[PDB]
Amino acid sequence: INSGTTCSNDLLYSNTEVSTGVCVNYDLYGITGQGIFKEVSAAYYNNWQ
Amino acid sequence: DNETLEYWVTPLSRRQYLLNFDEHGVITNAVDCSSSFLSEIQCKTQSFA
Ligand SMILES: *[C@@H]1O[C@H](CO)[C@@H](O)[C@H](O)[C@H]1NC(C)=O
Ligand SMILES: *[C@@H]1O[C@H](CO)[C@@H](O)[C@H](O)[C@H]1NC(C)=O
């Protein structure tokens, strides 16, 4: 629950931009919460992570 | 040419390990928590040293 790509479209919203530096509510592919984003240069993600 | 076939098999069970992840996210070390006394100390401190 709250993670994956089997999604229910009963409440449909449009995709927004990932805005950085401000406190936001987020719903990232099921993951929900509140926080501040910061764009980074990461090299530790494989093709399945 | 002095080649050999090898296929080593051991059984699996559900058990607790302590894993060490490095800077790149690679598993480098593991300890089975119920195998020895030092492994019990390592799993109760959550430290490899
Ligand atoms: C605080 O407010 C300023 C606008 O005055 C904004 O640029 C900044 O991102 C805000 N800080 C946070 C953490 O939201
Ligand atoms: C294979 O092992 C035998 C041992 O009697 C040796 O004489 C032979 O040279 C070896 N061949 C190779 C390719 O290593």
Curated annotation (Swiss-Prot), chain A:
Functional summary from the UniProt entry = Attaches the virion to the cell membrane by interacting with host receptor, initiating the infection.
Q: What is this protein called?
A: Spike protein S1
Q: Which gene does this sequence derive from? A: S
